Structure formats: C-alpha cells, structure tokens
C-alpha cells in the first residue's frame, strides 16, 4: 500500500547499524552519502531513541503559537553555542525548505521594519501580504556567478560588489549562499579569502548575509558551520537542516543575529504546526550531545582528508574522474569522457549508497577502515562502468 | 536563545499528561483544542515513546528515493484499512501543507499522464494564478445537501470541465469557518458530479480525519463516500511526530506509475521511519481504545453543553459539531479565547474547539465550566 516515488523497484530497508543499512533480503549497504547527507551520526543510535521516548512520555507536543518548551529553551542555547553563534536566536521548523523560506521572509521583514521597503532583492549564486509580493517578481532574484576556486578568493568575491552596483544596493535585501555547494555542483568550495570579503561587502551594502548550511552544517565539513572555515566568518542568518537531528526526527531551522531578531520582534510567522516540536527537538539535543562528546566535527576533518586522498588516488586508475573535491566529509567527483547514475547503480549493486557529478558524504562517525571499504566499493563501481 | 513568534508571552511548557499541560511556573491548562487539533490521543503516551525509541534503534532513517522500509510497508496497509480505503496507496510526508501540495500536484499530473494537460484548475470552497483556483460558495446546512452540492456542477459548466483537474474540500470545515458541515446528501452528490466530470475529488482530512469527527474519515459519514485522494495529517501521529500524507486510489497511483513512472523528488523526511513508527503506534491506540467511538460520545456531550450555554448567551449565534470538531459562531472570539486562557483553557468571530479524543466525560464538563466562565467574562 506504499505510494512509491517511481516505478523502479525499491528495496525494503529493515535495519540500520552505524554506517550500514540492511534490506529484507539480508543485503548490506555502506551508506556512502548518509542517505542524502542526513544521517550524520550513523544509524541505530539507541541513545537518541531513548531521549525521544523520554520526551514523548513527558511532553510530546505544544503548538508554538501557544507555548515554548523547556527542551526547546535548552536546545536553542546549546545549539547556538556549539556553532559559535552564542547570542543568536533559533527558529525551529520541520524541514530545510521551511527553514530557507523563513530566512528569506526574515531578511525581507528586517528591512521593512527599519523603514527601507525598497530593499527586496535576494541575491543567490550559480548554480545554487502586500509587503512580501515584491519577492514574486523575477527581478527579485539576481544571480551571482559561480565561485572560481582557482582565483584569489577576495578577488573572486568582488563579483558581489559588481552585482550590487548594477542592481542598486538600495534595492537589495540579502545575499544567500551555501558555503560549500551541495548537489548542484558537488562540493564546490570558494578559495580562501572569499567569504571574508563577502561578509565585508555585505556589511558595507547593509544587506543580510544568509548562510545556507542545510547540507554543509553541523560538523559535516569539519567545522560546526562550514562558513567558519573562512577565518571564523559569521552570517546574519544561518540556515540549518537535514543533519540537525541526523535522521532521527524531522528538524531544521535558522539562527538569526540578535539585531535581526529584535528588529522583527519590535513593531514573525503563524503556521508551522510542528515547528518547535518537543520530541523532534529532543532528538536534536541528543544528537548534539553525541556530536560534541564524540567530536564528530574533528572526526569529519580526519576522515574527510582520508577519503579525499583516496578519491585522488583513484584518478590515476580512472582519469574519467575530471575533478575531485572535498571539505570535511562533503566530497564530490566530476565525471567525463577522456553517467553519475550509471556509476550510482553499479555502486548500489555492489552495496554502496551514493547521493555527471557524484556527491559523497558518509556519517561523521565512519571509521578509517570503513572509509577504505567505501573506496574499495567505489573503485569496483567505476571498474564496472568504466 | 529561542526565536519566539512574537513579542507576546510564551509560557514554557514542561509536562503534558492526558488532556492537561503544565508550565515551568506550575500552571495547569486543559487542552481544549488539542493544540491545533493535533494531540488526538492525549499527552504523555509512553507507549508511543517506546515505539519511536525501538524504531530509532533499529532503523531511524532511509531516503525514499533509495529505500522503502518495513515499518512504512506495515503502516501503509494498516492506515489504509483503518480509514476505509484498504487498497489505496499511502504517500507519506512530514506536514499538512506538504500533503495538500502533494495532492494537488498528483491530481494535475494524473491528467497529464492521460493526455489532458488542459485540466489544470483546482476548485476549492470558500472560505477553506487566480483563474486556476475557482471557488465554490461555502456550504449552507440550512439548504438541502444535494441541492447545495449541485452548485459544483454549475461551476464546472461555467469553467469548462476540460480545464478542471480536481475539486478539493474539507468534509467538515476547520478554522476558516469553525466546524461548518454540509447537510446530508452533499458529498454523495459531489462524488457523482466529479465522476461525471472526470475530475479528481480530493478530501482534505488533515484536521477532520483519524476519528476526529466520529468516523475514521469524516467524509465517510456521508453514505460511505470515498474520494480519489484523501489528505491526512495532525491526528496521524497525534503530536508525537511530524507526520502527514495522502491516500490515493489505485486508479490514480497506477496512472502515474504506468505513465512517466515518476511522481515527486522532494521532501527529505518523507516516509521517515521513526515518524511512521509513531503513526503506527498512535493507530494501534486509536483502534484499541475505539477513540472514533469515543469522539462520537464525548462530542455529543460537549455539543449539548454548548447548546445549553447558547440558551444563556444569545451572542452564540451558532453552535456546531461533528464528533469532537466543534465550533461557536459569535455575533469577539479572540477575547473569549484570551479570557479562557486566563482561566486555564487552551483554545484553537469563530471559536474552534476540539479536545483530545481520549478526554473523559468529567473532563468535558470541566472544559465547559471553564468556557462558561470565559463567556461570562466577555458577554
């Protein structure tokens, strides 16, 4: 009675242990992409399950329009401190899209509250009521060129000033970007100096800098927030998701600078039935305890380096691997002729889960031996197809 | 460090037990609207917690583009059977809006697969591009059910059925018009009109379903009528997990699968094992404690209580109720809600009421006593 996403055959999963998944045929798979870069701390954590059970028995649900909860109050502070934004305000939601839309809405409202309704444009980067209707206009979404990792970071970032100049800085509300790109361009990352310059340009222009960390955050890239890898730069709004509760509960949200929060509170949103959901928040808190206790951020750095080195080593045997990239445990492989689905299918056949581009990112808790196993499975898939 | 929704006070809740909530200040509140008609089986069900914990320890997450799960396969069948749509296909998502969005996209894709891309309009009903969303007048229970529904056919002829993909409606209206329900014969006529027009009938039971209105699905109260797509949420996991979804008739499912063979690619947590496990546990309880039957009994008691109050407060222009989904039309509601909260009663010119289906007879009387006090304060 399941409405499958497509007519293809869907294996039925029955168990998840660590970095592995098992189906109802006994087949075992190494979760090379943590599902969709979601299962950051691995599968089968009884610790998280116990925490969710305790919250369900104590206080499972309250609607945010009526009550806050002790677990949300606790988690908000814990999360803010972990990511290095101790004074920021946490807006909890159930998914990444809700979190992203909340961020955009907030950026727009911020300027309207300050008496600057002319600021409505939201700049985004390739390849990633009456007060809000301007966001519906095509002109509200100007595009910044794709970053060029081979160019001096600050110089590359200056492209933002150029765009602002032609758009008219007084018409711009914000600039939103994934510090390290996800699926759109597998693990593409700007050169050093890029975000430091972006932060400064945004401050000069008076626009809100939104960091989309839905995929790159929570230790994934070897740092609490990937943006911090660039001289500790901090955004005005950080968007979180997927890895927040690491697959244990539908949890996402954003962290807003005090200035932004206070502006909107003076003079935010209504729906979201499960926004701030106690059981889901408890899952996030338990996951955070683990991320910190096991120093998975540090683990992502070490294991990420090992996996990247392995992918680079494979290029000699498979020169069809046009480019290999990685920041922490968010890596990418660009393929070409001297398909990503063809190699993905072959990988699955061999028991390797993956996301012309291949996005890789196993659980931050993966062991060194398991990283080598992942590489061996990938080599087999490449051999089958190439 | 919490980003509150507004500058007003948001008491910090710390415990939920049965139909009661308690804050860190010691205060107790009677959850008269189950939050937002979400907590259908009451608060603090350790049973559900244990089921979620067991799932988290066994298989917490798989992405639907890669794997299905044994718990989802189990739940899909159990849910389908419980709601009276045993052969329907379950599409799981994490929230009501995702479910409704999915239903509309499915209805539109259905016609595209059949070579009728012109059918793009989705008819909805007041007050639940503009031209793509025709509006049917709100129901009039004072009018004959079939007579009232006939307006849908007239609207179809006005719009041109060849340009319509579906008709979506809440069997019993929610907050838009507190518990407004059509007269007998309404949906029976709707079903026939849709069949004749060849359009998809979508029943939005996100608030009205899962026993809320004294039936597995509220639509069934109208001669067992079944939709082509039933949208569910809220009461699904009853506040224990963000879970929602839709059940599609085999005809609809097979048409998409037999055509392009693909539906949707978004929704990271769609089919989420832990949330689905909560839904399965909630379903076990709903069936075991016959909460659908309870809603009918407790609902009749609460409605009678509201009608008695109406005799005292003529400002209560209308008092309505279907199972435990009730409404009070005033001729104001906001002030009553504020006065009620001060007295310890949680509420949703309309007042929507709907306590947990597990509420006891004594607790219904307690709810009525608190409401009476709030009414006296304002009226």
From TrEMBL, chain B:
SUPFAM superfamilies, alphabetized: PLP-dependent transferases (SSF53383)
PROSITE patterns: AA_TRANSFER_CLASS_3
InterPro entries: Aminotrans_3, Aminotrans_3_PPA_site, PyrdxlP-dep_Trfase, PyrdxlP-dep_Trfase_major, PyrdxlP-dep_Trfase_small
One Pfam family of this chain: Aminotran_3
Tagged with keyword Isomerase: no
This protein's UniProt keywords: Aminotransferase, Pyridoxal phosphate, Transferase
Name of the protein: Aminotransferase, class III
Family as reported in the entry's similarity comment: Belongs to the class-III pyridoxal-phosphate-dependent aminotransferase family.
UniProt GO MF annotations: pyridoxal phosphate binding; transaminase activity
Species of provenance: Deinococcus radiodurans (strain ATCC 13939 / DSM 20539 / JCM 16871 / CCUG 27074 / LMG 4051 / NBRC 15346 / NCIMB 9279 / VKM B-1422 / R1)
